[PDB]
């Protein structure tokens, strides 16, 4: 069963460089072009370039010729993607993908049938920081404000998983300080404010958990 497995999330200062790898299996590594594509967050897809794992030769869209090299290890059938002179707007999820058919001489002509899970690379001068968590105190709505953390992601659940109905965890926004902020909210029967207790459970790898009670 064909599988492209990428390496984990990365954070970099502007100006630094990053290497994402892509470990492939389930087919003859050397027989298929491998393609990279990225996505800036809440944005479209942007095609980066392609490698022939047999010859090693590559091709990049103009925007990436300066700064991307692609390389390959045939013994471990892994492909490596290296992006240098990083800038904040390189912050994106990076995907590797495999062409549908075997090498046809047409490398950019590729159909991305099998994709990695993606690698988040965030470029920012911020430094690692776990959130402060504040109550959104109150059919009635209550919540948690998960504020001033970096980098993505956090996870949030309510009463340790129990409560799922009526829950909305919103996508984080990036503040002017370069830390993220996110809210999680839940609607609930007005008549439960007196009776049930509500707790949001917040995890920030790396590496931080907070449990916060919601009363009133």
């Amino acid at each position: 069963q064909v599988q492209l497995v990428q390496s984990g999330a990365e954070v970099r200062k502007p100006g630094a460089s990053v290497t994402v790898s892509c470990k492939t299996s389930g087919y003859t590594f050397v027989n298929f072009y491998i393609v990279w594509v990225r996505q800036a967050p809440g944005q479209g897809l942007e095609w980066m370039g392609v490698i022939n794992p047999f010859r090693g030769d590559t091709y990049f869209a103009q925007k990436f010729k300066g700064r991307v090299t692609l390389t390959r290890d045939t013994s471990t059938s892994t492909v490596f993607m290296e992006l240098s002179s990083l800038r904040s707007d390189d912050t994106a999820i990076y995907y590797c993908a495999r062409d549908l058919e075997m090498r046809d001489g047409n490398n950019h002509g590729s159909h991305l049938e099998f994709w990695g899970q993606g690698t988040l690379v965030t470029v920012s001068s911020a430094s690692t920081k776990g959130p402060s968590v504040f109550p959104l105190a109150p059919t009635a709505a209550l919540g948690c404000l998960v504020k001033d953390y970096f980098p993505e992601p956090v996870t949030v659940s309510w009463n340790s998983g129990a409560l799922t109905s009526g829950v909305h965890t919103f996508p984080a926004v990036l503040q002017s300080s370069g830390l993220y902020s996110l809210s999680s909210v839940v609607t609930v029967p007005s008549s439960s404010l007196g009776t049930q207790t509500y707790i949001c459970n917040v995890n920030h790898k790396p590496s931080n958990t907070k449990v916060d009670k919601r009363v009133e």
Binding site: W115, Q117, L136, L145, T169, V173
Partner: protein
């Protein structure tokens, strides 16, 4: 270089009915080897993209007949029949005739009866105030369609430039959206004003609604 235009940019569909997306290219995608280099990809919320159709009209393995890709030259169409919640997501076209480019994506969502947001406002916790910052939160909950507008007021003065917001994906059960907005002030600015007001305009509302509090 080659430009891809997709319309519409968002497409609501009643469960059961058909959807059509156009993809138009700035020049022909037919190569001299006789292939039409246009592929459609689907990206479902929080997943990788996946291939639906390659070369104008070939289904990728596992994609059901419900998906039909066609056209040629500078005009292509993806038709989706019998749309269900599982099809919701952004559909991109992509040409590989030259250096590949994507179109900008078509958001496909489930059409439902218009629904007015329930609005809530949350004061900043005494807890966060200890440290110089005040965040005031507004929740616009369970509405449809997606366009909605939040305006913040502070002693009735219109706020601009000091708020951020985001929206959930469509609930595949109830087909609504929710929106969260955050006004950040400094503790000092927060303590010198009294009325904090969340003003909301939607299409499900006969006129704009306000939720507010004092302190």
């Amino acid at each position: 270089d080659i430009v891809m235009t997709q319309s519409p940019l968002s497409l609501p569909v009643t469960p059961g009915e058909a959807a059509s997306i156009s993809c138009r290219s700035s020049q022909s995608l037919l190569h001299t080897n006789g292939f039409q280099y246009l592929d459609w990809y689907l990206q479902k919320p929080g997943q990788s993209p996946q291939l639906l159709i390659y070369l104008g009209s070939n289904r990728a393995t596992g994609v059901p007949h419900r998906f039909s890709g066609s056209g040629s030259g500078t005009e292509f169409t993806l038709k989706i029949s019998r749309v269900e919640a599982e099809d919701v997501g952004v559909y991109y076209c992509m040409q590989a005739k030259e250096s590949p480019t994507f179109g900008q994506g078509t958001k496909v969502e489930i059409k439902r009866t218009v629904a007015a947001p329930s609005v809530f406002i949350f004061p900043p916790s005494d807890e966060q105030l200890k440290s110089g910052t005040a965040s005031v939160v507004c929740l616009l909950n369970n509405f449809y369609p997606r366009e909605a507008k939040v305006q913040w007021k502070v002693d009735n003065a219109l706020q601009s430039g000091n708020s951020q917001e985001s929206v959930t994906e469509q609930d595949s059960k109830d087909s609504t959206y929710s929106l969260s907005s955050t006004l950040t002030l400094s503790k000092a600015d927060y303590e010198k004003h009294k009325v904090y007001a969340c003003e909301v305009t939607h299409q499900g509302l006969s006129s704009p609604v306000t939720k507010s509090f004092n302190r």
